[PDB]
Amino acid sequence: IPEYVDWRQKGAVTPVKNQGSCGSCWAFSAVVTIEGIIKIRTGNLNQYSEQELLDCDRRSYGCNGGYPWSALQLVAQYGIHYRNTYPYEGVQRYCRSREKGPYAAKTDGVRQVQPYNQGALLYSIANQPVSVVLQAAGKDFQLYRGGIFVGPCGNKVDHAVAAVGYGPNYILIKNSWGTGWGENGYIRIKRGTGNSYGVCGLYTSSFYPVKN
Amino acid sequence: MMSGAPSATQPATAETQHIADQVRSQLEEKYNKKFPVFKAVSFKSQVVAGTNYFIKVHVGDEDFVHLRVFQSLPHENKPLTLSNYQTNKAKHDELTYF
């Protein structure tokens, strides 16, 4: 695997979004990995609907929290529409898939990275964008405005983001908070510390879509 | 695993009371009621693109109200907003998501 991966530089990553005041990060996190595998497989970079997973994943609790795995599962079982077709409203409504005609695309399944394992995580990120969780509750996290984050943060993981690349001593994350946070919506978080939870719990819980 | 859920109920701090007191008037103006007593008793948080606070405030006699207050990301410097409230609530009613 390379020293550096940046999926943005390979055209696989769509602009930074803002989840607003809804706890829909799990929807957001999932969508970045969907957009990434489809570009990697098809040559096309599209935007897919977070608002559909929010309305439609019935193992998750809308704006009250939920799971990237079940959201990735929904897309492997049924499919997803385009974002332009089913736009983000920041509030859970009823699930409107059926009244938006056929799904724009679908994935084959979901896999889970082996947790607490940095190398495992990096290998998967060398293949495509991965859904990872961290602890974002802290003021330093929220206050982040650039550089390589070493903390402080604990490993009470509360927030699903997507790992879109790595270097020698960070892992590059796309966050859903707007571009006016951090490094234009991105944060580079320290790796290599020998801490097995990862920094901010980063190696706790990681899934990626399978699609050929 | 489960991302985006509020925290467990924590008992109010001074921060809790200040956040309530910021939003006191907005309540009072929406409810068409003046609350003489306005004491934060409990809280939950959830991390969004900002922070939702869910606050149980002792307002009354044995009478409570629950608050849903939005706090922005620091870099945004927007004032606290009362997104929603619940009325006629009890000491022992659980602070839940709404």
PDB file of C-alpha atoms in Angstrom:
ATOM      1  CA  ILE A   1       0.000   0.000   0.000  1.00  0.00           C
ATOM      2  CA  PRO A   2       1.140   3.548  -0.863  1.00  0.00           C
ATOM      3  CA  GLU A   3       2.584   6.109   1.556  1.00  0.00           C
ATOM      4  CA  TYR A   4      -0.188   8.431   0.682  1.00  0.00           C
ATOM      5  CA  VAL A   5      -3.781   7.934  -0.402  1.00  0.00           C
ATOM      6  CA  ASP A   6      -6.208  10.852  -1.216  1.00  0.00           C
ATOM      7  CA  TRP A   7      -9.402   9.790  -2.958  1.00  0.00           C
ATOM      8  CA  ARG A   8     -10.205  13.391  -3.626  1.00  0.00           C
ATOM      9  CA  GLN A   9      -7.187  13.472  -5.894  1.00  0.00           C
ATOM     10  CA  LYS A  10      -8.677  10.561  -7.704  1.00  0.00           C
ATOM     11  CA  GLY A  11     -12.001  12.356  -8.272  1.00  0.00           C
ATOM     12  CA  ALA A  12     -13.841   9.924  -5.934  1.00  0.00           C
ATOM     13  CA  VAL A  13     -15.093  12.400  -3.312  1.00  0.00           C
ATOM     14  CA  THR A  14     -18.035  14.865  -3.636  1.00  0.00           C
ATOM     15  CA  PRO A  15     -18.223  18.245  -1.848  1.00  0.00           C
ATOM     16  CA  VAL A  16     -18.413  18.646   1.899  1.00  0.00           C
ATOM     17  CA  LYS A  17     -22.044  18.684   3.222  1.00  0.00           C
ATOM     18  CA  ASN A  18     -23.690  19.843   6.410  1.00  0.00           C
ATOM     19  CA  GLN A  19     -25.924  17.627   8.445  1.00  0.00           C
ATOM     20  CA  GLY A  20     -27.304  20.563  10.384  1.00  0.00           C
ATOM     21  CA  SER A  21     -29.142  19.964  13.648  1.00  0.00           C
ATOM     22  CA  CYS A  22     -30.263  16.395  12.885  1.00  0.00           C
ATOM     23  CA  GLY A  23     -28.273  13.391  14.207  1.00  0.00           C
ATOM     24  CA  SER A  24     -28.002  11.957  10.658  1.00  0.00           C
ATOM     25  CA  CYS A  25     -24.207  11.522  10.505  1.00  0.00           C
ATOM     26  CA  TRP A  26     -24.597   7.758   9.984  1.00  0.00           C
ATOM     27  CA  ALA A  27     -26.596   8.565   6.765  1.00  0.00           C
ATOM     28  CA  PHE A  28     -23.838  10.971   5.714  1.00  0.00           C
ATOM     29  CA  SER A  29     -20.987   8.690   6.460  1.00  0.00           C
ATOM     30  CA  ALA A  30     -22.616   5.866   4.474  1.00  0.00           C
ATOM     31  CA  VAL A  31     -23.279   8.089   1.404  1.00  0.00           C
ATOM     32  CA  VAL A  32     -19.558   9.080   1.057  1.00  0.00           C
ATOM     33  CA  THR A  33     -18.586   5.457   0.810  1.00  0.00           C
ATOM     34  CA  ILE A  34     -21.448   4.804  -1.749  1.00  0.00           C
ATOM     35  CA  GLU A  35     -20.256   7.769  -3.898  1.00  0.00           C
ATOM     36  CA  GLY A  36     -16.669   6.503  -3.611  1.00  0.00           C
ATOM     37  CA  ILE A  37     -17.233   2.811  -4.579  1.00  0.00           C
ATOM     38  CA  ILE A  38     -19.490   3.825  -7.550  1.00  0.00           C
ATOM     39  CA  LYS A  39     -16.895   6.224  -8.944  1.00  0.00           C
ATOM     40  CA  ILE A  40     -14.155   3.651  -8.473  1.00  0.00           C
ATOM     41  CA  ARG A  41     -16.230   1.054 -10.232  1.00  0.00           C
ATOM     42  CA  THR A  42     -18.006   3.036 -12.941  1.00  0.00           C
ATOM     43  CA  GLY A  43     -15.806   6.009 -13.697  1.00  0.00           C
ATOM     44  CA  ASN A  44     -18.657   8.230 -12.518  1.00  0.00           C
ATOM     45  CA  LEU A  45     -18.787  10.574  -9.520  1.00  0.00           C
ATOM     46  CA  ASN A  46     -22.421  11.171  -8.424  1.00  0.00           C
ATOM     47  CA  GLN A  47     -24.143  12.453  -5.340  1.00  0.00           C
ATOM     48  CA  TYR A  48     -26.520  10.070  -3.555  1.00  0.00           C
ATOM     49  CA  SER A  49     -29.293  10.860  -1.088  1.00  0.00           C
ATOM     50  CA  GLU A  50     -28.528  10.954   2.714  1.00  0.00           C
ATOM     51  CA  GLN A  51     -32.215  11.975   3.235  1.00  0.00           C
ATOM     52  CA  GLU A  52     -33.385   8.639   1.825  1.00  0.00           C
ATOM     53  CA  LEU A  53     -31.390   6.664   4.333  1.00  0.00           C
ATOM     54  CA  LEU A  54     -32.652   8.877   7.093  1.00  0.00           C
ATOM     55  CA  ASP A  55     -36.343   8.353   6.110  1.00  0.00           C
ATOM     56  CA  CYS A  56     -35.953   4.776   5.077  1.00  0.00           C
ATOM     57  CA  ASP A  57     -33.606   2.914   7.357  1.00  0.00           C
ATOM     58  CA  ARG A  58     -35.937   1.403   9.918  1.00  0.00           C
ATOM     59  CA  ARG A  59     -33.125  -0.079  12.054  1.00  0.00           C
ATOM     60  CA  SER A  60     -31.989   3.494  12.668  1.00  0.00           C
ATOM     61  CA  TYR A  61     -33.811   6.237  14.574  1.00  0.00           C
ATOM     62  CA  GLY A  62     -33.773   9.186  12.163  1.00  0.00           C
ATOM     63  CA  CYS A  63     -32.389  12.345  13.698  1.00  0.00           C
ATOM     64  CA  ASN A  64     -32.090  10.545  17.033  1.00  0.00           C
ATOM     65  CA  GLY A  65     -29.096   8.483  15.864  1.00  0.00           C
ATOM     66  CA  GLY A  66     -28.480   5.286  13.919  1.00  0.00           C
ATOM     67  CA  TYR A  67     -26.063   2.854  12.190  1.00  0.00           C
ATOM     68  CA  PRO A  68     -23.854   3.113   9.102  1.00  0.00           C
ATOM     69  CA  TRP A  69     -23.940  -0.626   8.708  1.00  0.00           C
ATOM     70  CA  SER A  70     -27.727  -0.821   8.413  1.00  0.00           C
ATOM     71  CA  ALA A  71     -27.693   2.151   6.162  1.00  0.00           C
ATOM     72  CA  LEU A  72     -25.137   0.445   3.900  1.00  0.00           C
ATOM     73  CA  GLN A  73     -27.263  -2.685   4.035  1.00  0.00           C
ATOM     74  CA  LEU A  74     -30.377  -0.855   2.841  1.00  0.00           C
ATOM     75  CA  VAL A  75     -28.413   0.195  -0.322  1.00  0.00           C
ATOM     76  CA  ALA A  76     -27.230  -3.392  -0.839  1.00  0.00           C
ATOM     77  CA  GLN A  77     -30.711  -4.743  -0.535  1.00  0.00           C
ATOM     78  CA  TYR A  78     -32.647  -2.180  -2.491  1.00  0.00           C
ATOM     79  CA  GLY A  79     -30.596   0.743  -3.825  1.00  0.00           C
ATOM     80  CA  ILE A  80     -30.265   4.512  -3.642  1.00  0.00           C
ATOM     81  CA  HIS A  81     -31.538   7.581  -5.516  1.00  0.00           C
ATOM     82  CA  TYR A  82     -29.597  10.620  -6.497  1.00  0.00           C
ATOM     83  CA  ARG A  83     -29.282  13.462  -4.018  1.00  0.00           C
ATOM     84  CA  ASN A  84     -30.880  15.886  -6.516  1.00  0.00           C
ATOM     85  CA  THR A  85     -33.903  13.582  -6.616  1.00  0.00           C
ATOM     86  CA  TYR A  86     -34.210  13.083  -2.899  1.00  0.00           C
ATOM     87  CA  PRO A  87     -32.690  16.165  -1.287  1.00  0.00           C
ATOM     88  CA  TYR A  88     -31.635  16.711   2.297  1.00  0.00           C
ATOM     89  CA  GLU A  89     -34.185  18.377   4.512  1.00  0.00           C
ATOM     90  CA  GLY A  90     -32.534  17.901   7.932  1.00  0.00           C
ATOM     91  CA  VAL A  91     -35.610  16.318   9.408  1.00  0.00           C
ATOM     92  CA  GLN A  92     -36.918  12.751   9.143  1.00  0.00           C
ATOM     93  CA  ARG A  93     -40.073  12.506   7.041  1.00  0.00           C
ATOM     94  CA  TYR A  94     -41.788   9.417   5.601  1.00  0.00           C
ATOM     95  CA  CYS A  95     -39.832   7.236   3.220  1.00  0.00           C
ATOM     96  CA  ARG A  96     -40.436   8.459  -0.294  1.00  0.00           C
ATOM     97  CA  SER A  97     -38.325   6.048  -2.348  1.00  0.00           C
ATOM     98  CA  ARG A  98     -41.254   4.458  -4.153  1.00  0.00           C
ATOM     99  CA  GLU A  99     -42.550   7.689  -5.329  1.00  0.00           C
ATOM    100  CA  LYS A 100     -39.215   8.611  -6.860  1.00  0.00           C
ATOM    101  CA  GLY A 101     -39.172   5.817  -9.454  1.00  0.00           C
ATOM    102  CA  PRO A 102     -36.330   3.404  -9.717  1.00  0.00           C
ATOM    103  CA  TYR A 103     -33.094   3.604  -7.628  1.00  0.00           C
ATOM    104  CA  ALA A 104     -30.210   5.270  -9.432  1.00  0.00           C
ATOM    105  CA  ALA A 105     -27.745   2.562  -8.240  1.00  0.00           C
ATOM    106  CA  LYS A 106     -27.166  -0.314  -5.814  1.00  0.00           C
ATOM    107  CA  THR A 107     -24.201  -2.014  -4.059  1.00  0.00           C
ATOM    108  CA  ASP A 108     -23.554  -5.797  -3.589  1.00  0.00           C
ATOM    109  CA  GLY A 109     -23.096  -5.747   0.236  1.00  0.00           C
ATOM    110  CA  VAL A 110     -21.208  -4.391   3.255  1.00  0.00           C
ATOM    111  CA  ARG A 111     -18.017  -5.496   4.885  1.00  0.00           C
ATOM    112  CA  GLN A 112     -16.562  -4.668   8.318  1.00  0.00           C
ATOM    113  CA  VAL A 113     -12.958  -3.889   8.888  1.00  0.00           C
ATOM    114  CA  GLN A 114     -11.276  -5.794  11.665  1.00  0.00           C
ATOM    115  CA  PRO A 115     -11.558  -3.319  14.619  1.00  0.00           C
ATOM    116  CA  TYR A 116      -8.750  -1.917  16.730  1.00  0.00           C
ATOM    117  CA  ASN A 117      -6.360  -2.541  13.929  1.00  0.00           C
ATOM    118  CA  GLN A 118      -4.673   0.365  12.234  1.00  0.00           C
ATOM    119  CA  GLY A 119      -3.102  -1.618   9.403  1.00  0.00           C
ATOM    120  CA  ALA A 120      -6.450  -3.317   8.636  1.00  0.00           C
ATOM    121  CA  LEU A 121      -8.015   0.087   8.403  1.00  0.00           C
ATOM    122  CA  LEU A 122      -5.300   1.480   6.089  1.00  0.00           C
ATOM    123  CA  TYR A 123      -5.479  -1.382   3.700  1.00  0.00           C
ATOM    124  CA  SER A 124      -9.224  -0.886   3.212  1.00  0.00           C
ATOM    125  CA  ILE A 125      -8.729   2.918   2.733  1.00  0.00           C
ATOM    126  CA  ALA A 126      -6.134   2.122   0.099  1.00  0.00           C
ATOM    127  CA  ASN A 127      -9.094   0.386  -1.733  1.00  0.00           C
ATOM    128  CA  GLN A 128     -11.896   2.869  -1.271  1.00  0.00           C
ATOM    129  CA  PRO A 129     -13.387   5.359   1.187  1.00  0.00           C
ATOM    130  CA  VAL A 130     -14.381   3.752   4.512  1.00  0.00           C
ATOM    131  CA  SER A 131     -16.975   4.582   7.140  1.00  0.00           C
ATOM    132  CA  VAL A 132     -15.312   5.109  10.536  1.00  0.00           C
ATOM    133  CA  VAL A 133     -16.497   6.379  13.909  1.00  0.00           C
ATOM    134  CA  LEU A 134     -14.856   8.812  16.418  1.00  0.00           C
ATOM    135  CA  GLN A 135     -15.567  10.827  19.550  1.00  0.00           C
ATOM    136  CA  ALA A 136     -16.644  14.324  18.377  1.00  0.00           C
ATOM    137  CA  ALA A 137     -18.374  15.532  21.638  1.00  0.00           C
ATOM    138  CA  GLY A 138     -15.169  17.329  22.854  1.00  0.00           C
ATOM    139  CA  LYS A 139     -14.559  21.087  22.593  1.00  0.00           C
ATOM    140  CA  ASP A 140     -11.134  20.677  21.103  1.00  0.00           C
ATOM    141  CA  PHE A 141     -12.649  18.509  18.328  1.00  0.00           C
ATOM    142  CA  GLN A 142     -15.322  21.073  17.711  1.00  0.00           C
ATOM    143  CA  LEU A 143     -12.741  23.825  17.865  1.00  0.00           C
ATOM    144  CA  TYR A 144     -10.431  22.120  15.377  1.00  0.00           C
ATOM    145  CA  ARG A 145      -9.269  24.456  12.638  1.00  0.00           C
ATOM    146  CA  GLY A 146      -6.337  22.618  11.034  1.00  0.00           C
ATOM    147  CA  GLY A 147      -3.268  20.391  11.450  1.00  0.00           C
ATOM    148  CA  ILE A 148      -2.852  16.879  12.685  1.00  0.00           C
ATOM    149  CA  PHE A 149      -5.237  16.227  15.522  1.00  0.00           C
ATOM    150  CA  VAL A 150      -3.694  14.349  18.406  1.00  0.00           C
ATOM    151  CA  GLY A 151      -6.384  15.240  20.790  1.00  0.00           C
ATOM    152  CA  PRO A 152      -7.508  15.629  23.284  1.00  0.00           C
ATOM    153  CA  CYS A 153     -10.406  13.254  22.855  1.00  0.00           C
ATOM    154  CA  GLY A 154     -11.606  10.065  24.472  1.00  0.00           C
ATOM    155  CA  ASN A 155     -12.935   6.905  22.912  1.00  0.00           C
ATOM    156  CA  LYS A 156     -16.588   7.412  23.683  1.00  0.00           C
ATOM    157  CA  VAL A 157     -17.376   7.333  19.968  1.00  0.00           C
ATOM    158  CA  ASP A 158     -20.555   9.183  18.975  1.00  0.00           C
ATOM    159  CA  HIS A 159     -20.060  10.328  15.414  1.00  0.00           C
ATOM    160  CA  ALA A 160     -19.694   8.436  12.011  1.00  0.00           C
ATOM    161  CA  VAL A 161     -17.458  10.078   9.390  1.00  0.00           C
ATOM    162  CA  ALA A 162     -15.630   8.797   6.351  1.00  0.00           C
ATOM    163  CA  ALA A 163     -11.887   8.101   5.926  1.00  0.00           C
ATOM    164  CA  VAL A 164     -11.015   9.316   2.425  1.00  0.00           C
ATOM    165  CA  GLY A 165      -7.265   8.875   2.551  1.00  0.00           C
ATOM    166  CA  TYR A 166      -4.039   8.601   4.706  1.00  0.00           C
ATOM    167  CA  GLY A 167      -0.466   9.588   5.000  1.00  0.00           C
ATOM    168  CA  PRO A 168       2.544   8.630   7.050  1.00  0.00           C
ATOM    169  CA  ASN A 169       1.092  10.000  10.290  1.00  0.00           C
ATOM    170  CA  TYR A 170      -2.419  10.914   9.723  1.00  0.00           C
ATOM    171  CA  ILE A 171      -5.703   9.498   8.386  1.00  0.00           C
ATOM    172  CA  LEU A 172      -7.713  12.091   6.284  1.00  0.00           C
ATOM    173  CA  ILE A 173     -11.459  12.300   7.283  1.00  0.00           C
ATOM    174  CA  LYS A 174     -14.404  13.992   5.499  1.00  0.00           C
ATOM    175  CA  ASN A 175     -16.792  15.411   8.131  1.00  0.00           C
ATOM    176  CA  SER A 176     -20.361  16.597   7.618  1.00  0.00           C
ATOM    177  CA  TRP A 177     -20.190  19.926   9.328  1.00  0.00           C
ATOM    178  CA  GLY A 178     -19.718  22.351   6.494  1.00  0.00           C
ATOM    179  CA  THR A 179     -16.512  23.560   4.928  1.00  0.00           C
ATOM    180  CA  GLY A 180     -16.114  26.304   7.489  1.00  0.00           C
ATOM    181  CA  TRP A 181     -14.995  23.686   9.974  1.00  0.00           C
ATOM    182  CA  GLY A 182     -11.443  22.395  10.130  1.00  0.00           C
ATOM    183  CA  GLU A 183      -9.526  22.090   6.895  1.00  0.00           C
ATOM    184  CA  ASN A 184     -12.404  22.972   4.495  1.00  0.00           C
ATOM    185  CA  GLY A 185     -14.587  20.327   6.053  1.00  0.00           C
ATOM    186  CA  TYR A 186     -11.698  17.852   6.500  1.00  0.00           C
ATOM    187  CA  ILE A 187      -9.638  16.839   9.526  1.00  0.00           C
ATOM    188  CA  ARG A 188      -6.290  14.956   9.597  1.00  0.00           C
ATOM    189  CA  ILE A 189      -6.167  12.856  12.705  1.00  0.00           C
ATOM    190  CA  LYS A 190      -2.939  11.330  14.123  1.00  0.00           C
ATOM    191  CA  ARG A 191      -2.128   7.644  13.589  1.00  0.00           C
ATOM    192  CA  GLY A 192       0.797   5.481  14.731  1.00  0.00           C
ATOM    193  CA  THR A 193       0.423   6.181  18.478  1.00  0.00           C
ATOM    194  CA  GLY A 194       0.300   2.488  19.493  1.00  0.00           C
ATOM    195  CA  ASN A 195      -3.171   3.290  20.870  1.00  0.00           C
ATOM    196  CA  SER A 196      -5.366   0.482  19.685  1.00  0.00           C
ATOM    197  CA  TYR A 197      -8.727   2.277  20.000  1.00  0.00           C
ATOM    198  CA  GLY A 198      -7.078   4.804  17.692  1.00  0.00           C
ATOM    199  CA  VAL A 199      -7.110   8.527  18.306  1.00  0.00           C
ATOM    200  CA  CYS A 200     -10.631   9.634  19.286  1.00  0.00           C
ATOM    201  CA  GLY A 201     -11.657   6.014  19.099  1.00  0.00           C
ATOM    202  CA  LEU A 202     -11.031   6.037  15.337  1.00  0.00           C
ATOM    203  CA  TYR A 203     -10.513   2.174  15.105  1.00  0.00           C
ATOM    204  CA  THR A 204     -13.659   1.221  16.892  1.00  0.00           C
ATOM    205  CA  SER A 205     -16.239   0.558  14.152  1.00  0.00           C
ATOM    206  CA  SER A 206     -15.582   0.591  10.417  1.00  0.00           C
ATOM    207  CA  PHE A 207     -17.615  -0.594   7.392  1.00  0.00           C
ATOM    208  CA  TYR A 208     -17.307  -0.309   3.644  1.00  0.00           C
ATOM    209  CA  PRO A 209     -19.604  -1.161   0.761  1.00  0.00           C
ATOM    210  CA  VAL A 210     -18.779  -4.128  -1.543  1.00  0.00           C
ATOM    211  CA  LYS A 211     -19.616  -3.541  -5.222  1.00  0.00           C
ATOM    212  CA  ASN A 212     -17.804  -5.870  -7.633  1.00  0.00           C
TER     213      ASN A 212
ATOM    214  CA  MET B   1     -21.541   1.663  16.744  1.00  0.00           C
ATOM    215  CA  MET B   2     -24.843   3.650  17.334  1.00  0.00           C
ATOM    216  CA  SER B   3     -23.853   7.185  16.210  1.00  0.00           C
ATOM    217  CA  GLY B   4     -25.777  10.370  16.938  1.00  0.00           C
ATOM    218  CA  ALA B   5     -27.731   9.495  20.069  1.00  0.00           C
ATOM    219  CA  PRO B   6     -28.016  11.925  23.002  1.00  0.00           C
ATOM    220  CA  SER B   7     -25.939  11.318  26.065  1.00  0.00           C
ATOM    221  CA  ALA B   8     -27.290   9.941  29.305  1.00  0.00           C
ATOM    222  CA  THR B   9     -28.969  12.341  31.629  1.00  0.00           C
ATOM    223  CA  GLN B  10     -26.538  14.445  33.467  1.00  0.00           C
ATOM    224  CA  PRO B  11     -27.441  16.858  36.220  1.00  0.00           C
ATOM    225  CA  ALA B  12     -27.341  20.499  35.458  1.00  0.00           C
ATOM    226  CA  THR B  13     -24.206  22.557  35.830  1.00  0.00           C
ATOM    227  CA  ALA B  14     -23.731  26.280  35.790  1.00  0.00           C
ATOM    228  CA  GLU B  15     -23.334  25.933  32.043  1.00  0.00           C
ATOM    229  CA  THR B  16     -26.656  24.189  31.936  1.00  0.00           C
ATOM    230  CA  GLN B  17     -28.291  27.013  33.794  1.00  0.00           C
ATOM    231  CA  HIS B  18     -26.708  29.641  31.702  1.00  0.00           C
ATOM    232  CA  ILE B  19     -27.829  27.987  28.471  1.00  0.00           C
ATOM    233  CA  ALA B  20     -31.397  27.774  29.830  1.00  0.00           C
ATOM    234  CA  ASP B  21     -31.352  31.370  30.998  1.00  0.00           C
ATOM    235  CA  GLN B  22     -30.305  32.475  27.510  1.00  0.00           C
ATOM    236  CA  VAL B  23     -33.451  31.044  26.035  1.00  0.00           C
ATOM    237  CA  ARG B  24     -35.832  31.857  28.915  1.00  0.00           C
ATOM    238  CA  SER B  25     -37.446  34.713  27.169  1.00  0.00           C
ATOM    239  CA  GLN B  26     -37.981  32.997  23.863  1.00  0.00           C
ATOM    240  CA  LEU B  27     -39.961  30.351  25.786  1.00  0.00           C
ATOM    241  CA  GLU B  28     -41.928  32.894  27.682  1.00  0.00           C
ATOM    242  CA  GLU B  29     -42.815  34.734  24.515  1.00  0.00           C
ATOM    243  CA  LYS B  30     -43.853  31.557  22.681  1.00  0.00           C
ATOM    244  CA  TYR B  31     -45.768  30.127  25.586  1.00  0.00           C
ATOM    245  CA  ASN B  32     -47.475  33.423  26.529  1.00  0.00           C
ATOM    246  CA  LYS B  33     -46.429  32.610  30.134  1.00  0.00           C
ATOM    247  CA  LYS B  34     -43.961  34.134  32.485  1.00  0.00           C
ATOM    248  CA  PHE B  35     -41.992  31.669  34.498  1.00  0.00           C
ATOM    249  CA  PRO B  36     -41.054  33.227  37.931  1.00  0.00           C
ATOM    250  CA  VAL B  37     -38.748  30.232  38.708  1.00  0.00           C
ATOM    251  CA  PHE B  38     -36.427  28.813  35.962  1.00  0.00           C
ATOM    252  CA  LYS B  39     -34.156  26.208  37.324  1.00  0.00           C
ATOM    253  CA  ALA B  40     -32.186  23.741  35.226  1.00  0.00           C
ATOM    254  CA  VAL B  41     -32.390  20.335  36.819  1.00  0.00           C
ATOM    255  CA  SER B  42     -31.110  17.900  34.187  1.00  0.00           C
ATOM    256  CA  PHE B  43     -29.576  17.526  30.731  1.00  0.00           C
ATOM    257  CA  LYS B  44     -28.625  15.456  27.709  1.00  0.00           C
ATOM    258  CA  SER B  45     -26.525  16.379  24.848  1.00  0.00           C
ATOM    259  CA  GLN B  46     -26.279  15.255  21.289  1.00  0.00           C
ATOM    260  CA  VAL B  47     -23.563  16.089  18.822  1.00  0.00           C
ATOM    261  CA  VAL B  48     -24.923  17.325  15.439  1.00  0.00           C
ATOM    262  CA  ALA B  49     -23.370  20.080  13.293  1.00  0.00           C
ATOM    263  CA  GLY B  50     -23.410  21.914  16.650  1.00  0.00           C
ATOM    264  CA  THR B  51     -24.975  20.704  19.895  1.00  0.00           C
ATOM    265  CA  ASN B  52     -28.561  20.009  20.854  1.00  0.00           C
ATOM    266  CA  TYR B  53     -29.205  20.329  24.555  1.00  0.00           C
ATOM    267  CA  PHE B  54     -32.240  18.649  26.071  1.00  0.00           C
ATOM    268  CA  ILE B  55     -32.895  20.391  29.363  1.00  0.00           C
ATOM    269  CA  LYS B  56     -35.340  19.715  32.192  1.00  0.00           C
ATOM    270  CA  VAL B  57     -36.053  22.994  33.869  1.00  0.00           C
ATOM    271  CA  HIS B  58     -37.961  23.263  37.218  1.00  0.00           C
ATOM    272  CA  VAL B  59     -40.295  26.063  36.528  1.00  0.00           C
ATOM    273  CA  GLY B  60     -43.005  25.937  38.813  1.00  0.00           C
ATOM    274  CA  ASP B  61     -44.256  24.159  41.775  1.00  0.00           C
ATOM    275  CA  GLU B  62     -44.064  20.575  41.009  1.00  0.00           C
ATOM    276  CA  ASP B  63     -44.199  21.771  37.404  1.00  0.00           C
ATOM    277  CA  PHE B  64     -41.437  21.335  34.784  1.00  0.00           C
ATOM    278  CA  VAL B  65     -40.762  22.087  31.163  1.00  0.00           C
ATOM    279  CA  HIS B  66     -38.235  20.313  28.753  1.00  0.00           C
ATOM    280  CA  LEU B  67     -36.183  22.452  26.351  1.00  0.00           C
ATOM    281  CA  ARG B  68     -34.503  21.617  23.095  1.00  0.00           C
ATOM    282  CA  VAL B  69     -31.772  24.168  22.612  1.00  0.00           C
ATOM    283  CA  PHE B  70     -29.487  24.508  19.575  1.00  0.00           C
ATOM    284  CA  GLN B  71     -25.901  25.604  20.048  1.00  0.00           C
ATOM    285  CA  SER B  72     -23.860  26.281  16.839  1.00  0.00           C
ATOM    286  CA  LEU B  73     -20.265  25.388  16.036  1.00  0.00           C
ATOM    287  CA  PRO B  74     -17.994  27.901  17.661  1.00  0.00           C
ATOM    288  CA  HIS B  75     -16.830  29.365  14.418  1.00  0.00           C
ATOM    289  CA  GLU B  76     -20.357  30.358  13.654  1.00  0.00           C
ATOM    290  CA  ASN B  77     -21.026  32.649  16.507  1.00  0.00           C
ATOM    291  CA  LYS B  78     -24.803  32.318  16.336  1.00  0.00           C
ATOM    292  CA  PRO B  79     -26.851  32.796  19.424  1.00  0.00           C
ATOM    293  CA  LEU B  80     -28.526  29.912  21.265  1.00  0.00           C
ATOM    294  CA  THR B  81     -31.914  28.957  19.862  1.00  0.00           C
ATOM    295  CA  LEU B  82     -34.931  27.308  21.497  1.00  0.00           C
ATOM    296  CA  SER B  83     -35.734  24.868  18.639  1.00  0.00           C
ATOM    297  CA  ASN B  84     -38.610  23.253  20.599  1.00  0.00           C
ATOM    298  CA  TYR B  85     -40.156  22.775  24.107  1.00  0.00           C
ATOM    299  CA  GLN B  86     -42.420  20.443  26.056  1.00  0.00           C
ATOM    300  CA  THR B  87     -44.826  21.620  28.727  1.00  0.00           C
ATOM    301  CA  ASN B  88     -46.733  20.134  31.652  1.00  0.00           C
ATOM    302  CA  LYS B  89     -43.908  17.819  32.339  1.00  0.00           C
ATOM    303  CA  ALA B  90     -43.093  16.044  35.636  1.00  0.00           C
ATOM    304  CA  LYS B  91     -40.057  15.813  37.916  1.00  0.00           C
ATOM    305  CA  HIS B  92     -39.916  12.127  37.008  1.00  0.00           C
ATOM    306  CA  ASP B  93     -40.656  12.352  33.321  1.00  0.00           C
ATOM    307  CA  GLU B  94     -37.575  11.203  31.368  1.00  0.00           C
ATOM    308  CA  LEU B  95     -35.737  13.652  29.205  1.00  0.00           C
ATOM    309  CA  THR B  96     -36.251  12.020  25.860  1.00  0.00           C
ATOM    310  CA  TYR B  97     -35.498  13.057  22.282  1.00  0.00           C
ATOM    311  CA  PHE B  98     -38.075  15.298  20.483  1.00  0.00           C
TER     312      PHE B  98
END
